[model samples]
Target: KLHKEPATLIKAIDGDTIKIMYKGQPMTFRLLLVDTPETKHPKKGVEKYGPEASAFTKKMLENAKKLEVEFDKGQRTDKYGRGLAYIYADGKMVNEALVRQGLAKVAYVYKPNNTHEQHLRKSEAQAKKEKLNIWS
Candidate 1:
């Protein structure tokens, strides 16, 4: 009966994360292409604006009923086999949104994915110039 990808959302967790139900399976997603402060990272002792970043993500996706994902070549999954994807909702890419809002930093993991690298770099620059979260 479920022909289309089911709508999924973040049930719980920090920012830049989500719990997606796909094909009757629950999948946890950690937004790629950007890095937010670790609010509950057991080893890192919490980074700057960690809580704020989490709150920001929660607000952004709180009402996102529909979601789509784009996977990178040779980078579809993390070490744990969780699908690594660039999440988009309502015509906006969540990773880029975070960068533009200064909620996250551009995280260059490998060869850029399309023009996202350039976009993220520019966004991060703007966020830095404005001192959005860097100063906090």
Candidate 2:
């Protein structure tokens, strides 16, 4: 099992971003190794499948029995100051789930943080093979 910290999901900002209470303070976490379609960007506006991605994330978190955050061995925060990590809901990796569902594509892959690189890629491949969501 990987090192993880228990957290309370305050809200799901988007498919790949969430706000959580980690250590008695609110923290914004950008899901590691995956990027979903844009729903909150000014220029990009609402991308295709963006709302669906956001809804999926919100639903998953809302129904989860437990929530946790797992940071990679590398950087713990992004350039925008958001915490970077894999989000777990009832032991399921939400980052990977988004990819498997075709709501997100593997991106921002960097060294050490590639702990689940193969897993995420494999999920994306299957989603692509089926032409799911974003793959459509």
Candidate 3:
């Protein structure tokens, strides 16, 4: 359900975050409902699958060739000040796709924005059981 023009992804900022050219300016978005492993933490260093997740994200977007971002009801941004939304390319849900493929994990179940929670959780379950990607 995007009603307006979709933002174009310009760069990947590791795993769940990305930089897009939006409405004539640059915007950073944190994929909603999913948390990929941390690749850039001050003290955490690099967690497992962090690099893989980041690389996978980049590859996914490149393959999709067209990136779009959409926000949930009343959910525009995260408390940390990054834009919050689900991403899409080729009509597929990038957020859910990441979870299903095991590059990310279900997280931060804030209501209103829980539109994709059920699907995301199910993806996590399948990924875990299959020992796919990060779940391995």
Candidate 4:
């Protein structure tokens, strides 16, 4: 799939979510196949390693400048009203990059199992094997 949609990143909501302008339309993206440590918790308020993940996300975007998203077939928004999609930047999937670099987890534990679920699972295992980041 040649993803060509122009995405202007507004900000990182957390390690796993980002707000953006897709084709000039504001939307919030919930990463489809991965999850990062929680930076925004009500009671907990920033879980262990959450800051690292959140910082990584922000840095990744500031460097990339912008992003693009690919929505699942027949699937768009999640129940929480956020857009469900795979984030892409510099010709790479941001969700996969986070996992492959050991910055996130394969929490594909989500319903419908996105297109990159298997790949994310594989990357997560590799991260664990290499002790790439947190969550030993």
Top candidate (lDDT): 2
The order by descending TM-score is: 2, 3, 4, 1
Q: List model 3 lDDT by residue over 57-120, tens digit each.
A: 8888878866777788766877877888888887787788888888898987888788778888
RMSD of each: 4.0, 1.1, 1.6, 1.9
Q: Which stretches of model 2 miss by more than 4 angstroms?
A: none
Task: Write the residue-wise lDDT of candidate 1 on 40-72 in tens digits.
Answer: 877787788888888877776676766776666
Least accurate 10 contiguous residues by lDDT in model 3: 1-10
Q: Model 3's lDDT to the true fold?
A: 0.84
Per-residue error for 107 in candidate 3, Å, reads 0.6
Candidate 4, lDDT over the whole model: 0.80
Which of candidates 1 and 2 is the stronger one according to TM-score?
Answer: 2
* Candidates 3 and 4 compared by lDDT, better number: 3
User: TM-scores for all candidates?
Assistant: 0.83, 0.96, 0.91, 0.88
lDDT of 2: 0.92
Q: List, in order, the clash count of every candidate structure.
A: 0, 0, 0, 0
Q: Taking the tens digit of each residue's C-alpha lDDT, what string does model 2 give over 1-136?
A: 4698999989889888899999999989999999899999988799999999999999999999999899888889989989999999999999999999999999967997789999999999999999999998
Tell me how far the alpha carbon of residue 81 in candidate 3 is from the true structure, in angstroms, after superposition. Answer: 2.7
> What would the C-alpha RMSD of candidate 2 be, to one decimal place?
1.1
